[PDB]
């Protein structure tokens, strides 16, 4: 619901070219705040958000140790899954792991999730109850059994219900101005003649946070099926996001066309028109 | 913080 702490882990095997590549990133809501990358002499976990620049070495030392422990086990697991599926030792393969916790409006735990993927496809999922697993196949069933025997669910639930929630609180406090004080879209319409008798109206939403947004074109305030191209929401590179929506319109009929923007950072949905 | 608890597949 209200807020989340998620991590995304990628390990890629390179047999013959040393140990697997391992990258780990952490997000609060839509804001990345830490990263660990083992392509380096001594890879450390490092900050990726200015509100994380004021943590002491106790943070970085632990997170670095914890990151390296993760890389290690992901190496081991990459080996195991290669066996399970009897693949050649020459092949490069990808094990991914996402997990997160969400707060409800009361600031308390609402839900938790966790999911492994091998070569870009679900492998093993922690169920909603956080007490058991779903395996996609015979190999993943071997993994289910081993995690049952090891009480892995119980350990994951402690992380997700408790530790994860408690640090999310800390992070939301340290990045309050960015995470709670949202950034609404700066919003404008541009105009691009296609021919003699038609033009593209392009509705821009720029500089918005979080990433979730809706841009709609309407015709005399009603839903039309003209040509309406919508680009995928993209990062601005500074922590905010961008999107545009476009319609082709009969030249001279531009002002029958309104763009509607919805975003969590706006007091109210906004409406926008070409300004010649 | 990272998860301390690492499944063995």
């Amino acid at each position, epitope marked *: 619901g209200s807020h989340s702490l998620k991590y995304f882990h990628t390990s890629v095997s390179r047999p013959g070219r040393g140990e697997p590549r391992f990258i780990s990133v952490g997000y609060v809501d839509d804001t990345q705040f830490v990263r660990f990358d083992n392509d380096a002499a001594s890879p450390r976990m490092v900050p990726r958000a200015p509100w994380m620049e004021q943590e002491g070495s106790e943070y970085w030392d632990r997170e670095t140790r914890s990151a390296r422990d993760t890389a*290690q086990i992901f190496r081991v697991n990459l080996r195991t899954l290669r066996g399970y599926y009897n693949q050649s030792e020459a092949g490069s393969h990808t094990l991914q792991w996402m997990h997160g916790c969400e707060l409800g409006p009361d600031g308390r735990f609402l839900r938790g999730y966790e999911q492994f993927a091998y070569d870009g496809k679900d492998y093993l999922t922690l169920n909603e109850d956080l007490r058991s697993w779903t395996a996609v196949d015979t190999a993943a069933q071997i993994s289910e059994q081993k995690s049952n025997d090891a009480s892995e669910a119980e350990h994951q639930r402690a992380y997700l219900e408790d*530790t994860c929630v408690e640090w999310l609180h800390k992070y939301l406090e340290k990045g309050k101005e960015t995470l709670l004080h949202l950034e609404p879209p700066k919003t404008h319409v541009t105009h691009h003649p296609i021919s003699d008798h038609e033009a593209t109206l392009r509705c821009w939403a720029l500089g918005f946070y979080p990433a979730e947004i809706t841009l709609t074109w309407q015709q005399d305030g009603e839903g039309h099926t003209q040509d309406t191209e919508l680009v995928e929401t993209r990062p601005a590179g500074d922590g905010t996001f961008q999107k545009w929506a476009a319609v082709v319109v009969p030249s001279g009929e531009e002002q029958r066309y309104t763009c509607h923007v919805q975003h969590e950072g706006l007091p109210e949905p906004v409406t926008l028109r070409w300004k010649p | 913080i990272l998860n301390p608890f690492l499944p063995l597949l």
Partner: T-cell receptor
Amino acid sequence: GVTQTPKFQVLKTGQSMTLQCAQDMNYEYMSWYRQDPGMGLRLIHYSVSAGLTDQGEVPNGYNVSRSTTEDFPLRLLSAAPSQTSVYFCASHRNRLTEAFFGQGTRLTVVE
Amino acid sequence: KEVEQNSGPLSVPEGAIASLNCTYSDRGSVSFFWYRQYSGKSPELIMSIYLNGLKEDGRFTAQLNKASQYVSLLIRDSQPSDSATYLCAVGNHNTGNMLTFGGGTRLMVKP
């Protein structure tokens, strides 16, 4: 699943020896603890995987190495009375989950 | 010490309830264990606990409270075979040093 040897052992001040520890489970983490009579276990050294080692709370007097996943020998460099103790080896799936101990080694260092 | 248990020893009448307590200094601890040791033998795991609240297994109940930084063990219907050293161990995720053990509480079930 954790074989530790020897069960008992006497040493003269200044001798060296090696305590063996083998695990069948192929876990990444192995450890050495010691316990003096009527006291807690105190961590000597440990290893997070093949070819890595770190110091515990009471490293002094001892070395360790981890060529293979399976074995984690402990090495008394130069025996002293203060090392008279019971030594337990362990294996662990994760750094911070259950430790599975060996049968132990009682070691008396005599002058 | 980081992990505090009273060494005791403690008596409990046979058939009565035994209670054991353990405190730890570091809020960053995330795993908790009760081991049992019969004299000069290796610790055998009784119960592991990771979520706040209660966990039950036969005659054994463990309570964890991370806000107050204690774990406890409760033994129903105490038997002679429950005479032992009860060892509390925590996984301190801030320091990373495998499992940290308290000095142990020695319990005597008296018939």
